[PDB]
């Protein structure tokens, strides 16, 4: 309530209980703290509250996302909060935009990019590597490449064509692979 620590904040945000965020406005403003500080982020990977909220989705809808984003923008670090990259070597570079895309939630990626989400953050962690290089899923190290590689044409269309910020399909990742190269990389020989 009057004291908001890290485990309590994650406990609230996992369940999506929006009402418990009613006291979130004073505690930060009384203490001149930010959501991006080391106090409120996971120490293992550097994950912040927004990726935790996007990871734990109830029927594809988490009502605490708009409230969290509004409190972040009133705090004054909205830009620094939207795209908080992971820090662990096993998930380096992953962004809340990547988690939104990987969850096949068009509404959340729409609401996230329109307010300052970077559409070129390269998820170049050890988990996002080709299976022959100690990894599980290589989608091209890019939000647009990921959306194209998870068979989500609507989100690809939105990312390419949106008044807020467009990710050009000619952009190359760290490996230099473009969206077409990633789409070839994920391909199998199966018909489907």
């Amino acid at each position: 309530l009057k004291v908001f620590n890290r485990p309590i904040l994650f406990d609230i945000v996992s369940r999506g209980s929006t009402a418990d965020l009613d006291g979130l406005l004073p505690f930060l403003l009384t203490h001149k703290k930010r959501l991006t500080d080391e106090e409120f982020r996971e120490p293992s990977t550097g994950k912040t509250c927004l990726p935790k909220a996007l990871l734990n989705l109830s029927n594809g809808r988490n009502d605490t996302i708009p409230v969290l984003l509004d409190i972040a923008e009133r705090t004054g670090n909205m830009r620094e909060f939207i795209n908080s990259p992971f820090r662990d070597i096993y998930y380096r570079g992953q962004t809340a935009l990547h988690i939104a895309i990987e969850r096949r939630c068009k509404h959340y990626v729409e609401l996230l990019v329109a307010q300052g989400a970077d559409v070129h953050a390269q998820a170049r962690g050890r988990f996002f590597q080709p299976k022959d290089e100690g990894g599980y899923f290589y989608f091209g190290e890019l939000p647009l490449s990921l959306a194209a590689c998870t068979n989500q044409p609507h989100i690809v269309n939105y990312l390419t064509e949106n008044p807020h910020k467009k990710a050009d399909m000619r952009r190359q990742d760290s490996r230099g692979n473009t969206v077409l190269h990633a789409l070839v990389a994920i391909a199998d020989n199966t018909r489907e």
Binding site: T36, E38, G46, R79, E80, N83, S84, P85, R87, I89, R92, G93, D118, H120, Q122, R124, D168, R170, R171, Q172, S174
Partner: protein, 182 residues
């Protein structure tokens, strides 16, 4: 065409104004009321010669709880701004023995752009008087030449976020150094 992304990380001692430099290059206005300790998750559009580069800025501190997280920002770096203070002589003898070994070990084979910040403060009366109280003098340009010589820095120049001198040129040089892939 399609802008290429290059990662710049700025390393310097405490109270050197590296974050101030980042803000003054970002918004073209020095924040005299609030200076965040670190500026993070920013991309800036720059052009050098017929190319568009998105420069991703990373800031490292050591005041508290940041020294342990400094190694986390080293891997997959593209260019480093290794900075010191012109108005602080003690900011030059700490350059080679503690910054250099860890930056070389963690992220080897990268260009080094060592710079000196607050170039206007070397002629300030207060700083000169305080330095001469204990028999010290402002960091001379010869000191910068020696620093560039002994560490093999790509280039060194003086920038002052107060008077907005050469910051665009400094970042253009940093991006140019990042352009060659070893």
């Amino acid at each position: 065409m399609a802008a290429i992304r290059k990662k710049l990380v700025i390393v310097g001692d405490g109270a050197c104004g590296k974050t101030c430099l980042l803000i003054v290059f970002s918004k073209d206005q020095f924040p005299e009321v609030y200076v965040p300790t670190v500026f993070e998750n920013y991309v800036a559009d720059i052009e050098v010669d017929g190319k568009q580069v998105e420069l991703a800025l990373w800031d490292t501190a050591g005041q508290e709880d940041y020294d342990r997280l400094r190694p986390l920002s080293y891997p997959d770096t593209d260019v480093i701004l290794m900075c010191f203070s012109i108005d602080s002589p003690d900011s030059l003898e700490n350059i080679p023995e503690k910054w250099t070994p860890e930056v070389k070990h963690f992220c080897p084979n990268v260009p080094i752009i060592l710079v000196g910040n607050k170039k206007d403060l070397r002629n300030d009366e207060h700083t000169r008087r305080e330095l001469a109280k204990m028999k010290q003098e402002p960091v001379k340009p010869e000191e910068g030449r020696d620093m560039a010589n002994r560490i093999g820095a790509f280039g060194y120049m003086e920038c002052s976020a107060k008077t907005k001198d050469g910051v665009r040129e400094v970042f253009e040089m940093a991006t140019r150094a990042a352009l060659q892939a070893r």
